[PDB]
Amino acid sequence: HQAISPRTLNAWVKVVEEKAFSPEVIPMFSALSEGATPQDLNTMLNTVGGHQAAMQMLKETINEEAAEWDRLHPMREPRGSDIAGTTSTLQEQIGWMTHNPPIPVGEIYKRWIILGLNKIVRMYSPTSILDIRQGPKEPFRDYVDRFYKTLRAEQASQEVKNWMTETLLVQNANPDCKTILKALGPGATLEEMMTACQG
Amino acid sequence: HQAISPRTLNAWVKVVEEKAFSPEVIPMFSALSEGATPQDLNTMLNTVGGHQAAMQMLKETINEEAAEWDRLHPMREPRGSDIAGTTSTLQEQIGWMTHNPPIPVGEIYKRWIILGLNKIVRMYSPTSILDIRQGPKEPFRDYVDRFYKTLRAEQASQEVKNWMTETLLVQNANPDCKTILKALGPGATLEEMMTACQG
Amino acid sequence: PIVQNLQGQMVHQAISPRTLNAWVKVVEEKAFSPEVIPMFSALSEGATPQDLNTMLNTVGGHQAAMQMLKETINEEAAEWDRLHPMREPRGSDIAGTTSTLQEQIGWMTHNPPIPVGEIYKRWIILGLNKIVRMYSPTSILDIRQGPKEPFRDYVDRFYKTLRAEQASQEVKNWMTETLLVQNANPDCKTILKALGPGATLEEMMTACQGVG
Amino acid sequence: PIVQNLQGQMVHQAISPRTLNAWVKVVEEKAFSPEVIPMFSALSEGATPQDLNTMLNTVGGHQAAMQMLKETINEEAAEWDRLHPMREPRGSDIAGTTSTLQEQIGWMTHNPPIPVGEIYKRWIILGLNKIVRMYSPTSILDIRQGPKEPFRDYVDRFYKTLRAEQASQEVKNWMTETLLVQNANPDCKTILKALGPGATLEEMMTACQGVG
Amino acid sequence: PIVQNLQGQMVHQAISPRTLNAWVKVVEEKAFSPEVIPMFSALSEGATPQDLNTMLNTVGGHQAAMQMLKETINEEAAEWDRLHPMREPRGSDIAGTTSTLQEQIGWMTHNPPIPVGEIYKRWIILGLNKIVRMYSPTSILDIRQGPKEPFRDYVDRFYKTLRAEQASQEVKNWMTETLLVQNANPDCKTILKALGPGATLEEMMTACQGVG
């Protein structure tokens, strides 16, 4: 067994602190927590200072997923709470991972954490995408960058996102860009839209 | 035996001096001092520059724990001071950990440090959980953040913490949010409560 | 009541003087609240018709209540004689005005027993229910929670008035479901409505604890 | 109850009318305070399931409380049948709705006795505990000592509310240790904090006598 | 209690349900006034240790009072075992936790009788005295006659507080002699002092009748 690096822990704390709960924190967490035990994941979650409302929401999501795991599955076999790391121990976790075939308790807990963090990101998105409107002289590149950051935050359905990018993206634009976008018409990819709408 | 890394030592000193004494200091210490000998733990504690009142408190609590160990427990078997590393050598400390069987001299001293840090954090918390109260205009998100930071610093049993989580969060809210939370009723979850009290 | 002899024969047991005094205190001090009927049911456990008549002699002091109690007993006796035209108990015999004590004891010891005492007790309870319905100080629609009254006190008053009114069971269910919320004070009424329809009384009381 | 005959045979003893009237007074006048459960335990000493059902007929007047009492009795009967699949007492037999009185008497006189009465009493006490938890006028966090209230009255109110709330034993211990000091008025709270943690209630009451 | 059989054998008599309910009312409604101990002595006449434990189950609802009552019973049991190292009653046997009912009945019917019930009653009374000493709302030095209070009411309050405090007999005599005069209002205090020292309470009350 290898411990998580202090550099990795500091990186996780720093990215969480600076970015709050922007959508990129999920891929950053998945990158930093590769091959991590439930003990390591619990350590990384505990070391986060601030946003304790979000961390409690994550705890409640973990508890709900553990209850679902226990309902689906009524040495000692790993229960849902055992996978969560609250009741298990490091030796048990490593044994479960080393078993052939393995019980990837780390990946299950990571998936639960990812679900909780997606819910946190959706809750913490600053404004709804309907309110993302271009300014009178804001660049179209800046406005569409903001629009797509917000759209990534919402995590709406695929069809809903398609409709949004097709219709609301041009609807919320200022008249100067809006006229050009309607001239391009429906079916235009984003590349074509803003490469024709530049300047 | 490995020497404690300068990067790890600087990280511990920086987190202590920057966060003063917050609840995250306990898991940060547990993560940094993984597989640490009593000499390494003493190095980590002594290297801290400021908060010398808190370090004296931690020394006092370590002394009390060593006295309790001496009372309960009348390669030589180590005494409390021997566990604390005040009257033991590095070779003797690696003894009882490489021994067959090994008694975890490092983990016992780490546990004592954890108890002392728990007391330090409990008192360094600004207000008690019962005294945490939402302001007339405070948003529910920041009120919840303060509440759960204080609960993390509360230093009570887990059942009592669960009761606090279910009751005091609703009880301490301002009437504007208290009415909405009562309409939600018991059985709600923090996501639903925060979405309801967003306004 | 009825008590077995030392040799197994069942013989009449006279109602104790302090039991009668307790019934007198219930009749005189309680002012015909809804709780007189539970207390009448408790004090008259196993009572024969003669004992029941002895108890009714105490409520005989009130002229109107005694009159309606007697008329209701007569009506139920007429119904009994209509359905039921030792000897068979007649309507007046159940009341204990024409029969004799040994006859009542024999009826109560039949195999299967003839529950004459329970029948007369039920008729008396019907009459007492009517008397309680008269003496209710307010109707259910006039019960309103005060601005500062706790919801527990308002619920207790509401259900006491509901017991006094004695409407139909479906009407009673509708009343407890809807009129309880309607008559609550606005701050409590908001939470009651927010709970939604079909909420159990436990949910309403837990949600509204300390709101007043 | 159960009473021995003159020749040694154990036979059912009917619950006295004034005992039932006392239970009725507890149910009707006390408004489901925490003290109803001690009084129910006292009045139902040695009671059989039939006697317990007779007592429950009086609290049957309140619809909500009766409903939850019946549902809790049903739940505990289901648990009993789960663990326990003359004849063996079934869940409905313990309640006294399907069994017969002689069967209950025989169960209570077994060697060793089958404590059917105590079991049904415990189920009823669970239901009454739930009913008391509903009717509590305030939660424990809302009990606060007044500026002039003596600490004895505040402690009595606090422990009454604690009995009404019925939290976990560890949570209850934490509450009496901490929340009692927290909710005390400032002049009394100063002495409570100065006493330090772990102080017994006797120390708190003796130190705070006359402070208010 | 204990009751003789029809053939002369002494057998255990169960404590009546309404006696237990009376004890429950004393425990719950009286708030541990000094009068609970006379009432406990009255209600527990002839009680066996099992009956006493049944009565203590009702005061078990209060955690602190039950804890000190149990610890005082344990202390007196330890003293009994120290002085006293069928079979001899042990300390736990007097409490009725280890012994059996027939053993207690046999002890109470010995020639001369072994007063186990009175011993356990005395231990319980010691514990109740301690509990009453805690719950006293004011100390004896804080009892002061009001400007308009009659001397009879002030004397009654003073002696109630004296019973609650339970000081030494010599200290109690000094208190009733001196502190009663000291705390009286000035117009009554003048007459009390003019009566001189050693005046009986009858003289003080007769002289001060109507002064307030």
Numbering used by the authors:
A (entry chain A), B (entry chain D): 12 to 85, 96 to 220
C (entry chain C), D (entry chain C), E (entry chain C): 1 to 85, 96 to 222
What does the article say, verbatim?
The mature HIV-1 capsid is composed of the capsid (CA) protein arranged in a conical lattice of hexamers and pentamers. CA assembles into a conical lattice formed by roughly 200 CA hexamers and exactly twelve CA pentamers, the latter of which facilitate lattice curvature and closure around the viral genome. Monomeric CA consists of two folded domains connected by a flexible linker: The N-terminal domain (NTD) faces the outer surface of the capsid, where it stabilizes the hexamer, while the C-terminal domain (CTD) forms dimeric interactions that link hexamers together. Here, we present cryoelectron microscopy structures of continuous regions of the capsid lattice containing both hexamers and pentamers.
We therefore devised a lattice assembly scheme in which purified wild-type HIV-1 CA-6xHis is anchored to highly curved ~30-nm small unilamellar vesicle (SUV) scaffolds doped with nickel-chelated lipids. To determine whether SUV-templated CA lattice is comparable to that of CLPs and authentic capsids, we determined the structures of SUV-templated CA lattice in the presence of IP6 at pH 6.2 and at pH 7.4 by SPA. The estimated resolutions for the global pentamer structures were 3.3 Å and 3.1 Å, respectively. As predicted, the increased lattice curvature results in a significant increase in the pentamer to hexamer ratio, from ~1:20 to ~1:5, suggesting that fewer hexamers are needed to form a complete lattice around the highly curved SUVs. The global pentamer structures are virtually indistinguishable between CLP and SUV-templated lattice preparations. Although our CLP assembly scheme recapitulates the morphology and composition of authentic capsids, it only works at low-pH (pH 6.0 to 6.2) conditions. The liposome scaffold-based CA lattice templating technique we introduce here enabled us to overcome this limitation and to study lattice assembled under more physiological buffer conditions.
